[PDB]
Design an enzyme around this catalytic site. Structure first.
Site, PDB file in Angstrom:
ATOM      1  N   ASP A  35       4.459  97.608 -68.255  1.00 54.25           N
ATOM      2  CA  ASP A  35       4.309  97.235 -66.849  1.00 54.25           C
ATOM      3  C   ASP A  35       2.847  96.936 -66.515  1.00 54.25           C
ATOM      4  OD1 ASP A  35       4.483  96.917 -64.153  1.00 54.25           O
ATOM      5  OD2 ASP A  35       4.880  99.038 -63.702  1.00 54.25           O
ATOM      6  N   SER A 199      -3.441  81.393 -58.018  1.00 55.43           N
ATOM      7  CA  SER A 199      -2.819  80.158 -58.445  1.00 55.43           C
ATOM      8  C   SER A 199      -3.316  79.016 -57.580  1.00 55.43           C
ATOM      9  CB  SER A 199      -1.302  80.291 -58.339  1.00 55.43           C
ATOM     10  OG  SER A 199      -0.630  79.066 -58.578  1.00 55.43           O
TER      11      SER A 199
END
Length: 330
Positions: A35, A199
């Site tokens: 994770d 992004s």
């Protein structure tokens, strides 16, 4: 040193991925959920409340000649999906894919929430976010990666998750045969303890690319792709009959649909998520309403590039003095 381990979807939907991890001496192999959005290595154990164990493999520290109780240490964690676990702490030898760390903090669960009990395939979590998020008290502990880093050939790990198929976690090297083209690197903020990046925009299907900054985290422990409501609405508007359902808890779509792809930007590069990766199947057994793999982050407080996005790429988690993230197509 290096390590390399195969990671395998837990079910036909790729709801999560498990990777075998050797703990203790002699080795006890547990299948852990790696994770990159958390920083605790915790396991089902011989100390876990019996009624809360249902099929998991447990770590029994009393059977490990290298286990030592970390005196006075406790841990307690709550995850974004509302699940939680807590317990005490041992140090022991932990190996992943041939890479060994001695003195790793292994957090032994005394209690786990129902979601963990109900998932027989996940024996615990191995956190790969920054150690500043580790919950051990009163002395915070380091992640497996943080402990291994100085010994690694290069201070990196990579995630290569498969779509409906196994993939690979590598430690200490970049497998140049595992991706196409080049790897595009992008800046990371560690201020919130995550692999947080920005992004450069998105496209829906064959549509034009929208240049827009989207701050979010690369999180292998989250199944879906969670993005701003504007972006998510633009995606689902291209699917006839798709709608946001408050009763179901997100966007659903007719199972008869063909889903468009979704592209996200990494600098000037582009990662394309095929439409099929966005299908999470019937909302309940036999239903013709299917659950979407792109959902709104509104009210999460952060955008999350979870498995839906990451499995479309070869992803480098670069833990150099100034960390960065790399993405390649594959």
């Amino acid at each position: 040193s290096t390590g390399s381990a195969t990671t395998t979807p837990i079910d036909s939907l790729d709801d999560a991925y498990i990777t075998p991890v050797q703990i203790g001496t002699p080795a006890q192999t547990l299948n852990l959920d790696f994770d990159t959005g958390s920083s605790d290595l915790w396991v089902f154990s011989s100390e876990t409340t019996a009624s809360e164990v249902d099929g998991q493999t447990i770590y029994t520290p009393s059977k490990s000649t290298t286990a030592k109780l970390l005196s006075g240490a406790t841990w307690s964690i709550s995850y974004g999906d509302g699940s939680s676990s807590s317990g005490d702490v041992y140090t022991d030898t932990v190996s992943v894919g041939g890479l060994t760390v001695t003195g790793q903090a292994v957090e032994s669960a005394k209690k786990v929430s129902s979601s963990f009990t109900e998932d027989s395939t996940i024996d615990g979590l191995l956190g790969l976010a920054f150690s500043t998020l580790n919950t051990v008290s009163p002395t915070q502990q380091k992640t497996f990666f943080d402990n291994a880093k100085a010994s690694l050939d290069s201070p990196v790990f990579t995630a290569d998750l498969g779509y409906h198929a196994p993939g690979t976690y590598n430690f200490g090297f970049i497998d140049t045969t595992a991706y196409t083209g080049s790897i595009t690197y992008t800046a990371v903020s560690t201020k919130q303890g995550f692999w947080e990046w920005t992004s450069t925009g998105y496209a829906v299907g064959s549509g034009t690319f929208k240049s827009t900054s989207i701050d979010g985290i690369a999180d292998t422990g989250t199944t879906l792709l969670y993005l701003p409501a504007t972006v998510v609405s633009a995606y689902w508007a291209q699917v006839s009959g798709a709608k946001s359902s408050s009763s179901v808890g997100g966007y659903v779509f007719p199972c008869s649909a063909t889903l468009p792809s979704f592209t996200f930007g990494v600098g000037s590069a582009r990662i394309v998520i095929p439409g099929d990766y966005i299908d999470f199947g019937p909302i309940s057994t036999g239903s013709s309403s299917c659950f979407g793999g792109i959902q709104s982050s509104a009210g999460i407080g952060i955008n999350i590039f979870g498995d839906v996005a990451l499995k479309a790429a070869f992803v480098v988690f670069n833990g150099a003095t100034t960390p960065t993230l790399g993405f390649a197509s594959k």
